[PDB]
Amino acid sequence: YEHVTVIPNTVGVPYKTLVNRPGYSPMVLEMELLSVTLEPTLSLDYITCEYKTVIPSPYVKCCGTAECKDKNLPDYSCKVFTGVYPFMWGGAYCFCDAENTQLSEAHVEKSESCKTEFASAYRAHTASASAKLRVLYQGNNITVTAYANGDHAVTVKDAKFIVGPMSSAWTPFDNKIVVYKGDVYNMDYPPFGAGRPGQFGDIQSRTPESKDVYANTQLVLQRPAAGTVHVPYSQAPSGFKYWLKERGASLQHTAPFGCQIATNPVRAVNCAVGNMPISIDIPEAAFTRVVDAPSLTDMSCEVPACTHSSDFGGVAVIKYAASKKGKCAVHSMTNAVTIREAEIEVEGNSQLQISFSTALASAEFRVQVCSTQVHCAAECHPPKDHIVNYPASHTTLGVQDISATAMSWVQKITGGVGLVVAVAALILIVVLCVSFSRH
Amino acid sequence: YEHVTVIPNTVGVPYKTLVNRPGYSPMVLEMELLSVTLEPTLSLDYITCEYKTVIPSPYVKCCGTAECKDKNLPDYSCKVFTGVYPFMWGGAYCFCDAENTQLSEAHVEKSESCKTEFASAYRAHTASASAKLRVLYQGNNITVTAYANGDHAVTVKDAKFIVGPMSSAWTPFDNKIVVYKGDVYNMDYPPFGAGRPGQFGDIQSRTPESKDVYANTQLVLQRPAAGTVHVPYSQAPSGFKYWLKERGASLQHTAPFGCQIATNPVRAVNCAVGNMPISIDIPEAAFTRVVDAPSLTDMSCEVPACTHSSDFGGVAVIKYAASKKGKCAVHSMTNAVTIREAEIEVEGNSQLQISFSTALASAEFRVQVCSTQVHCAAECHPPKDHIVNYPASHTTLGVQDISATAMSWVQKITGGVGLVVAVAALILIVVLCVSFSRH
Numbered sequence A, B: 001y002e003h004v005t006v007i008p009n010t011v012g013v014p015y016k017t018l019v020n021r022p023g024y025s026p027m028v029l030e031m032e033l034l035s036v037t038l039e040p041t042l043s044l045d046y047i048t049c050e051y052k053t054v055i056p057s058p059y060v061k062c063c064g065t066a067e068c069k070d071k072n073l074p075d076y077s078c079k080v081f082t083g084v085y086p087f088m089w090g091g092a093y094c095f096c097d098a099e100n101t102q103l104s105e106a107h108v109e110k111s112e113s114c115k116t117e118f119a120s121a122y123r124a125h126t127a128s129a130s131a132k133l134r135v136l137y138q139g140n141n142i143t144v145t146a147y148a149n150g151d152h153a154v155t156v157k158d159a160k161f162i163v164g165p166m167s168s169a170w171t172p173f174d175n176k177i178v179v180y181k182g183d184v185y186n187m188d189y190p191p192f193g194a195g196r197p198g199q200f201g202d203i204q205s206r207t208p209e210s211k212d213v214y215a216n217t218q219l220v221l222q223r224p225a226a227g228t229v230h231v232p233y234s235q236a237p238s239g240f241k242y243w244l245k246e247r248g249a250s251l252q253h254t255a256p257f258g259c260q261i262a263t264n265p266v267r268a269v270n271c272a273v274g275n276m277p278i279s280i281d282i283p284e285a286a287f288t289r290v291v292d293a294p295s296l297t298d299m300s301c302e303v304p305a306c307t308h309s310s311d312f313g314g315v316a317v318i319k320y321a322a323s324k325k326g327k328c329a330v331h332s333m334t335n336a337v338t339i340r341e342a343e344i345e346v347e348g349n350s351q352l353q354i355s356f357s358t359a360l361a362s363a364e365f366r367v368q369v370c371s372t373q374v375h376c377a378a379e380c381h382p383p384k385d386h387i388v389n390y391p392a393s394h395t396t397l398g399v400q401d402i403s404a405t406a407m408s409w410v411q412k413i414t415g416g417v418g419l420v421v422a423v424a425a426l427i428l429i430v431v432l433c434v435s436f437s438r439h
């Protein structure tokens, strides 16, 4: 028997479904999502990290003019200065003083620290959904793990579970993300080969091991102080360090729908978005015939207490006469009331107790004990507490559902007004009938 | 100077773009795409290959019943047969002629050959385009390689090149593809864990090295007969072998737009789809001031011959006064006529010769040389060869807004009829004016 249902993607909230296969006793299954993961496919664009400025010892020509040569280093610059007469601790550097000249050069390389401290710029495309499902099958607890794309069949204890496709393709991740350690950010990082000084991605390489490095630090060489050999320069501070200090809140703190974000691999966990279709192939061995099941008659329902605390605080007691000892599945006949118990053992002449959760002001509902149905009713009270640390177990009710039996006031008022109209209409009709009888 | 142009997404076809920077001699750049690659991102779902059936020696219990134990092998069956009386070359094997039973078992496992001969079922998501562009920068041929997603800018000869984004995201690959060798197929392979006998995917594993194997071969053990000891069985033939024989044409031969398909990794190559925006950053050193450039005077154009066919069948000759010796760019002022040469040299009072390609039955175009223009026109002949093995070089085909010479017949007929209407209208107007002058 193939049974198809749809449940909300909310994690930690169980749902029950009734399987109706004529000739067999009704079966009730319970399903709960323990974990839902959306894992994006990423493609690395570049790695950015703190740059290291390299300045070799300056060259001083004691008498004569030095010349610069071009180099292919990422941001190489060279300049020759004249009219320089530097001093050493023991006296003047050299004798000739008229044309003593100096050559200064510098370039930029990625730091050796980039091996452990770096940020990765990724592009995201699509995501593969998967989930860990728990099902109460035949009175046992089975775990089913599958990809939620509708194309993955998993067999547990002779049942074929099909999960997905997902009703929604929404993700907390943007098309362009940056990942640092455990912190994922949705940032529009600059294009490769065209970074800016003082900004994220000022120095870039395609991979950590690459020798091909792009950098834009706007490094400018300056004239040395007279009497000295130091090499002054103007350079933008690393944009990597600024970014680390100004990162702001991470995605795991800002994401919608309570999404949890983790790295290595990058994934979103337990996002409360949309719903998930589930199809179960149930073997005939799992079914009990109606002739095998107990027959329950002479039943009645009492409800000694009801509070809409969303904690299954409602209690109902049903008296029954069983034809024989055995077990029957129990299921609510309304969406307004959820019953915690999936199955109940019945024997002889006795009563069973069940717990339920509802947001109804008046808990008027039908319950199916085995193959027969009882009717329950109660006046429910509000909770004293305002806030709880758990999600409600009951469903959302409409305006027509939340109404109490006290709504009879509405019927009395509406009927009164409707009667006034009906009478006035009759009076006009009678007068018109007479009016056209005499003219 | 920032210059932006757009070219058709074609391969092996040059395009000309005119760069107009006031105060400088006009620059003409020749661009050609040498290769365009669209590379899909794939995620492996499963591997399917040829299954092997293994049948261990049968166990014979001459005086008693053999028992059966189940196994967790990918596809396992076991059965006990009674009333067997097996024979060997030297005579009957079993002494007892009663209570003689035989235990038969068989299982399916992946063949050793699956490490080499297999088909991979992939899920396709998105694709990243890239291209190899030839640019005639400063008259030189330079190679520019970049991604075509409006990113990964590169610098060649101090010029920056940005390619894309592509005008179309169309791909020859469907969401589900199967790869065997150099042949990629758009086949809707069955879901993992639910393959069918006699069909592709009858045996499945997530990876070639995995010990987790799914199989569905409908293997059934049969009873032995005639005193033999063989173990007969019924099993569907591998769906892999059937698929290989019935593969049909691969995507390499069936894909639209002339797309070429390559594998390891999978690529779509040189698809003639949409267009490709190109942005070039041109260094100031690349421009020559109009004061330094040659300026031509007293120019005239003649056209010795014209053929409205491919491969620049037309020829034109332009006379000029060089003034200062030097070189300049040549560009067509119409889209109807394409000039093959990008630039010419000017000296003395010599003429220049260029070739052109047009679909015009009667050529009529202007040519700009060294910032000045001449008017060229000719009657063009048709080609004799109906079919060629190369694409047309001219911009387009004839349209309602373009016609041959000697079309004065159209003007004469139109004018004659229009005159008849104009006269008839005047006659009626004058008569009416008189009629309305009465009373």
Ligand SMILES: *[C@@H]1O[C@H](CO[C@@H]2O[C@@H](C)[C@@H](O)[C@@H](O)[C@@H]2O)[C@@H](O[C@H]2O[C@H](CO)[C@@H](O[C@H]3O[C@H](CO)[C@@H](O)[C@H](O)[C@@H]3O)[C@H](O)[C@H]2NC(C)=O)[C@H](O)[C@H]1NC(C)=O
Residues within 6 Å of the ligand: A014, A136, A139, A140, A141
């Ligand atoms: C299937 O298993 C759940 C138990 O919880 C699950 O399994 C565990 C191992 C873990 O994976 C969890 O993430 C799962 O939710 C069971 O659910 C109920 O049984 C609990 C007792 O085993 C019950 O807790 C009770 O005891 C604690 C004190 O220890 C009290 O505070 C509680 O009030 C309660 O009396 C728990 O509350 C139950 N959960 C629900 C949602 O009703 C299922 O019964 C089990 N199925 C079977 C029949 O084995």
Ligand SMILES: *[C@@H]1O[C@H](CO[C@@H]2O[C@@H](C)[C@@H](O)[C@@H](O)[C@@H]2O)[C@@H](O[C@H]2O[C@H](CO)[C@@H](O)[C@H](O)[C@H]2NC(C)=O)[C@H](O)[C@H]1NC(C)=O
Residues within 6 Å of the ligand: B032, B134, B139, B140, B141
């Ligand atoms: C710059 O490029 C010219 C075109 O290059 C040709 O086509 C390219 C796609 C590539 O295959 C290259 O190897 C080819 O040479 C080229 O000039 C040539 O152009 C024609 C084809 O249009 C070619 O058959 C012929 O050999 C060349 N003709 C010349 C030399 O005028 C050449 O590489 C170079 N020309 C210049 C401007 O220096």
Ligand SMILES: CC(C)CCC[C@@H](C)[C@H]1CC[C@H]2[C@@H]3CC=C4C[C@@H](O)CC[C@]4(C)[C@H]3CC[C@]12C
Residues within 6 Å of the ligand: A397, A398, A399, A400, A402, A403, A409, A410
């Ligand atoms: C004496 C008479 C007028 C009492 C009437 C009480 C009525 C007007 C009140 C009491 C409870 C209220 C409902 C409570 C729940 C909901 C669900 C909400 O999503 C829409 C409004 C709706 C449906 C409310 C409509 C108004 C409501 C029905």
Ligand SMILES: CC(C)CCC[C@@H](C)[C@H]1CC[C@H]2[C@@H]3CC=C4C[C@@H](O)CC[C@]4(C)[C@H]3CC[C@]12C
Residues within 6 Å of the ligand: B397, B398, B399, B400, B401, B402, B403, B410
């Ligand atoms: C008086 C006689 C000679 C008029 C003949 C006009 C013919 C030769 C010319 C005039 C307009 C031309 C058309 C103009 C536009 C188009 C639409 C284009 O998508 C295909 C070519 C086509 C269809 C041209 C074909 C040739 C054409 C039809």
